[PDB]
Symmetry: C2
């Protein structure tokens, strides 16, 4: 574990991702992803070990320890220098894909603030990821373009004038651009409306998946599925428009259940807080259920004195990889449920004692 | 059937019972019952045919065709002069009990407006019943005492100084009084509260039963314990509990209207859709649907339909009345076809 690997696996929620983005009650994050390949180098499907090593080596040489103004310094993490639990944490923080952990010459060039993650030797040689809190696809696209320009200064992209950027996936040819949004939709699930919505979203060339990428914790990721022939601007508007609708529909449904079944909803969310604050065993499944309830309670003003950032942190912190990393070494499922309960209840008791004791001074 | 029998079985809802009584959205009727026996005559349990027969002859001789000022003329109906479906209609109109239909010398002295029904030779020699629309136990008690005095002018009641009126059932001894209200409680049923309410009412010396003895969300609440209680205590025990149920059912009604407005409009209008368009319908579904539509009228969701029309259908679609109205016995399947047609026509009639 290098000092920079420790830096990226240490915190479940980066300071970058703790910032308040627009519509952050419904949209947790926005992701922009640009795929490219080296000109004259065979796509990862048919390239040699030597080729893959050169891609990583060229990045360590020209981009490691280098900087972009306004984004910060970039550090290169090689998958081969990371223990299995270290790699899982990077997955659970949404910094790398699961498939990157299986790539023998996989690596990722990460900005120190964790806003930019350039995956190397995944499905394409280069996958630039920009991750913003809340709803900011245009802002994420700008950062993506800065990193893209930065890399193209020293890398010649597989490009042709009639097809655009050449990618391994034939559908991906063109912009290499994929946009996804992470959304918390507890009211649309609760009111039994989401299963009549998802089929409509899939009609618009988008795809809906759970947090992993079933929808535990009522968290849904909506991303571009069809991009062949679309411009960058069309790709981002196709997702933006659907997300903005979902923001409105999820808000209306929250206001609806709050107005019609106020006490039942308070009972639901405080009972879930009750579980999190007193349980001695809890699985990931139930944790996700309860965290969703409490987050809905916070958003509606029912659950008081608890910030949403604590909940975002626990959603990552209670994942099985991160929980084992944080506890030091692998753990049986039963042991995890005991450690998870202790971590959640202690983190929660801590947040209500700060809120008790700093509020008391005033 | 005699001209007086035909009169009492012709209409499902008497003009008397169409009057708007107090709290009539929740309380359909109030009933007062005074039981008495002839002095020197054995209780129906051990009385002889000659004895039983004398009791009804005396009522024919002194009360048949006689009148009470402010109530109207009375007429005697003998159970042995009535066909079984005719007897069934009277049970379904709540004028007599089922046990009276099996009593060979049973009879009932009925006021022509159907406000008073004096059963003869049932569980006691005399059972004075007064039935009022809505929630008016006290007015029913006044009318009951008026009928009681009238009979006592010519009948010596079996009475003792330590015990009160002597009745066959030893726990009715004393006043011979039993009070009842028939209540429509759909919201407390929908909101799954009635089962936590009924056990509590049963604790207060009351009993809760179905429509004739809980289809259609209709509950009959009666005095269960009367021994040692005064008349005043018997009537107030039921009145206060009933008055609480009125408020609790009204609060639950307003509550669900506010919590699930369109779902409630959907439920009651779909039940109206069934009633106005079905070609087959059983007693069970009819009562289910009439309850929904009645709730809709009460909350203002369903307009242009009077609750009196619904009360009439609730009786009119009963299996006995349906067969009487159709002129003869009916297979259950045939009843379901004629019931649907009957409901459909009354409803189409009222919406023009
Ligand atoms: Mg570019
Ligand atoms: Mg008297």
């Amino acid at each position: 574990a290098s000092m920079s690997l420790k830096h990226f696996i240490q915190d479940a929620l980066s300071s970058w991702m703790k910032q308040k983005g627009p519509e952050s009650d419904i949209v947790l994050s926005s992701r922009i992803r640009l795929a490219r390949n080296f000109e004259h180098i065979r796509f990862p499907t048919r390239y040699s070990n030597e080729e893959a090593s050169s891609i990583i080596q060229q990045f360590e040489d020209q981009f490691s320890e280098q900087e972009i103004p306004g984004i910060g310094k970039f550090v290169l993490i090689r998958m081969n220098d990371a223990q299995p639990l270290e790699k899982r944490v990077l997955v659970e923080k949404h910094l790398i894909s699961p498939n990157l952990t299986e790539s023998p010459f996989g690596g990722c060039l990460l900005s120190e603030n964790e806003e930019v993650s350039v995956m190397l030797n995944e499905e394409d040689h280069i996958r630039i990821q920009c991750l913003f809190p809340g709803f900011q696809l245009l802002e994420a696209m700008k950062a993506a373009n800065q990193v893209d320009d930065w890399i193209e200064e020293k890398v010649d992209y597989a490009f042709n004038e009639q097809r655009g950027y050449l990618t391994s996936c034939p559908t991906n040819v063109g912009t290499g651009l994929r946009a996804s949004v992470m959304m918390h939709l507890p009211a649309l699930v609760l009111t039994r409306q989401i299963n009549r919505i998802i089929p409509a979203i899939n009609q618009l060339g988008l795809v809906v998946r759970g947090i992993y990428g079933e929808a535990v914790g009522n968290i849904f990721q909506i991303s571009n599925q069809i991009t062949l022939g679309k411009s960058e601007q069309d790709i981002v508007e196709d997702l933006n428009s659907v997300a903005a609708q979902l923001i409105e529909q999820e808000r209306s449904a929250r206001e609806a259940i709050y107005q019609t079944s106020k006490i039942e909803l308070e009972d639901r969310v405080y009972r879930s807080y009750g579980v999190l604050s007193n349980c001695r065993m809890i699985e990931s499944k139930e944790t996700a259920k309860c965290l969703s309830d409490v987050r809905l309670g916070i958003d509606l003003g029912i659950i008081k004195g608890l910030s949403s950032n604590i909940l975002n942190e626990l959603m990552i912190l209670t994942q099985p990889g991160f929980l084992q990393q944080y506890s030091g070494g692998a753990l049986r499922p039963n042991e995890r449920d005991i450690r998870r309960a202790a971590l959640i209840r202690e983190r929660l008791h801590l947040e209500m004692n700060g809120k008790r004791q700093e509020d008391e001074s005033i």
